[PDB]
Every structure is written in C-alpha cells, then in structure tokens.
From a paper:
The term Rid (reactive intermediate deaminase) refers to the hydrolytic deamination of highly reactive and labile enamines/imines to α-ketoacid and ammonia, a reaction that would be otherwise relatively slow if left to occur spontaneously. In the present study, we identified two functionally active [name] genes in the salmon genome, here named [name]-1 and [name]-2, and we performed an extensive biochemical and structural characterization of their products (SsRidA-1 and SsRidA-2). In order to better understand the structural bases of the observed differences in terms of protein stability and of enzymatic activity, the crystal structures of SsRidA-1 and SsRidA-2 were determined at 1.05 Å and at 1.36 Å resolutions, respectively. Monomeric SsRidA-1 and SsRidA-2 share the chorismate mutase-like fold common to all the members of the YjgF/YER057c/UK114 superfamily: monomers fold in a single compact domain of one six-stranded β-sheet packed against two α-helices.
Moreover, in SsRidA-1, an extra intermolecular β sheet is formed between residues Ile4-Arg6 of each monomer with the C-terminal Pro131-Val135 of the neighbouring molecule in the trimer. [name] active site has been reported to lie at the interface between monomers. Acetate ions are coordinated by the conserved residues Tyr21, Arg107 and Glu122, reported to be involved in the interaction with substrates in human [name] [hp14.5 protein, PDB: 1ONI35] and bacterial TdcF protein [PDB: 2UYN37]. The acetate molecules likely mimic the carboxylate group of [name] substrates. SsRidA-1 is an efficient catalyst with hydrophobic IA and possesses a mainly hydrophobic 15–20 loop. The conformational stability of the [name] [name] proteins was studied by monitoring the change in ellipticity at 220 nm, which reports on the α- helical content of the proteins, by varying the temperature from 20 to 98 °C. An almost flat trace was obtained for SsRidA-1, indicating that the protein conformation was not affected in this temperature range. However, considerations concerning sequence similarity, substrate specificity, conformational stability and structural features indicate that SsRidA-1 is the bona fide functional ortholog of the vertebrate [name]. SsRidA-1 appeared to be active, like the goat enzyme, on IA derived from L-Ala, L-Met, L-Leu and L-Gln whereas SsRidA-2 was one to two orders of magnitude less active on these IA except for that derived from L-Ala, i.e. 2-iminopyruvate. Three of these sequences were ascribable to a single 137 residues-long protein, here named SsRidA-1, sharing 71% identity with HsRidA.
Numbering used by the authors:
A (entry chain A), B (entry chain A), C (entry chain A): 2 to 135
Write the structure that this text describes.
C-alpha cells in the first residue's frame, strides 16, 4: 500500500525554468508540467511563431513521456494555454498530428501571459500502459 | 494490470470544437473537457449571458457524466474559467445548484479569452461510483 | 470496489469563498482547491505583496494537507496562477522553500484576474502516503 513516485528528468527536453520537475509519476499516473516551445539545448523559444512553438512543446512532451516509458497514446487530458485566442485553429492543426485519435480530454483558453513570453504552453496527464481501449 | 480507457461521446452534449474528446475515462477516473455554454444541437453559445452559459455548460457536463454512468455527485474537482471576474457571484449562484453539497475542490479565475468568445468554461475530474462519503 | 471520498475542512485555513471544498480526497488522491494568500481568521488577503501572499497561500495549503494526514512532500502537481508575470521569480523563490526537492510537476501562467484581486492562486494534486521515491 506504499505508492511509488518517480521524478522524470531527461536532457532530451529542456531543463525546468523554475522549481518544478518535468513530470512526476505516482503509481500509474503521470503529471506532465506545462511544456513551452523551447529548444532543449539552448532553452530559448524556437523561432517561427505559434505553430513552431506548439510543435516544439509537444516534441518536448513526447521526450518526457518516452523517458517514463509512455507515448502520446498514454495522454488522457491536456490543457492548452494560448497567448492569443486567434491562434486556436493553427494550434489545433499541429496538436492533432500528435494526438490523432482517441483524443485526450482538453481545456483551452487564452491567458494574459506565459513564461518567457511564450505563445503556447501545454500540460498533460498520462497513464502508464498497458492501456486497453473500450 | 492493463488499464481500461473509454472515450466518452454523446450527442446529448455538443460536438467538440477541436481535437479533443468530451471526456476520457481511465480505470475509475474521468477527465471531463472544458465545457462551454453551447447548445448541443446548433453548437452556438446560448443567449442571455453568463448565468445562461454557466447553466448550459453544466447541463452539458451532466450529459457527459451520465453517458459514463456518473452524476454530478461523482465530480471531485472543477476549474471555472471566466471572461469577467465580476461574474464570480453570478456564476457561483448557478454552480451551487448543480453541486449543492460535498462540493468539489475548485479553482476559479478570469482568463483573457475563451473559445468562441464564451463567458465561462468549466472542466472537471470525476470518479466513477460507487462512492462512499466519510 | 467502493471508493472512499472525504471532504477536507479545517478552520486552520480560510473558509472557502465560494461553493467549493478546501480539498477532496478520493481513495489516495487529494485535489486541493486554488489557495489564495488569505488570512484564515479574517479572510482578507495578507498585506505586503506577492511574496507574502504566496507564502500565505502555501501555509494555507499546508494546513489542508495536514488535515488529510499529508505534508508538502505529498504534492505531485501544482498550478501557479499569477496576476503579474513579472512576479515569476519572486513567487518561485517563496515556492521552493515549501517544495524544496522532488519538486511537483507544475504549470504557471499569468491570468487576467484572481478572486478578491489576489496576486497569486495555487492549486494542487497530492497523494496520501506512504510514498516511495524511485
């Protein structure tokens, strides 16, 4: 009845920019921090705008999931935080390439500002497999 | 040790306006997407302002819960996202009619903007019964 | 297969300012409401600015955790909601004194406004021990 916690850390995703872990696993549930569109090597936001940042944020998420033994199919809930609501459709177009069926539950909204002036931040809850779809 | 995931979908609530499922059940935990005050049939936000939209959002939530075999008493956490903080009391008055005792945990705040220009969006976590209160 | 829910309530933290419980425990998972920097006795936001409010919010969180038999080490995920993104570093300095290692997963962002005009609101997910770190 003792629950195992694992702090997930991989250099394949950027170092946290504050006092947080990239993700925390407790039993089979994985809480993934808000991912920004940052290059893992320089820590800087990638160039090219909201789609580029969304892609990088979700690539970063994928590396964190993989470090825990999971993939995008393990994600059950996300929150998509935008700097500009006008970007919803552009963000959705990128997002659906990573989550293409059996989509996560989601909330999405425009916030006042994101860390580092990012255009998008995406957090997630995942469940460590095996997963059976019904 | 294989966890069952169920994508929840009912035409009694609006179709998702983006690449997300209305809700996802994993084992006994149900992640409910951010609900807007949209009519399920037309997909348009209901008329009449923030209380009308809050009511419709929570009716939509209820239909999603029912599709999974749950009711409002299964909800353990919500997030209430507002277009206008001046609406907190009006939203609370509606909200407490759906969640009237053993209230969910909650966070609430004003965001910059919601999809479709909505006035309120409400996401939730629920647990599939039976539930025992202690 | 019946899941135990416990509504957490302690006068050592402020009374909820809306129709929500301070926290809800379901099985071993605890959903903690968004904590504001409010004095438990008067319900007013504490004086002195964002660090003072962050400290009080996290003291309040700690009293709620303790009421459930948990401590700060039980927290696996937080969300930090700011009135001003310029406060990220100041908030982080306070936050890391409460969560000093094996940090929770986290999302952080500036919202348009918080209840009562607060400068910071912090919600959390915790898991009731014993917890084993791996």
């Amino acid at each position: 009845s003792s629950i195992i916690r694992k702090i997930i850390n991989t250099s394949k995703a950027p170092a946290a920019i504050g006092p947080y872990s990239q993700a925390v696993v407790v039993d089979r549930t994985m809480y993934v921090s808000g991912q920004l569109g940052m290059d893992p090597a320089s820590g800087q936001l990638v160039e090219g705008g909201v789609q580029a940042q969304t892609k990088q944020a979700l690539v970063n998420m994928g590396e964190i999931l993989k470090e825990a033994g999971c993939g995008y199919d393990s994600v059950v809930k996300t929150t998509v935080l935008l700097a500009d609501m006008n970007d919803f459709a552009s963000v959705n177009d990128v997002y659906k390439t990573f989550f293409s069926s059996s989509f996560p539950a989601r909330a999405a909204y425009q916030v006042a500002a994101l860390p580092r002036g990012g255009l998008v931040e995406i957090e997630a809850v995942a469940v460590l497999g095996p997963l059976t779809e019904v």
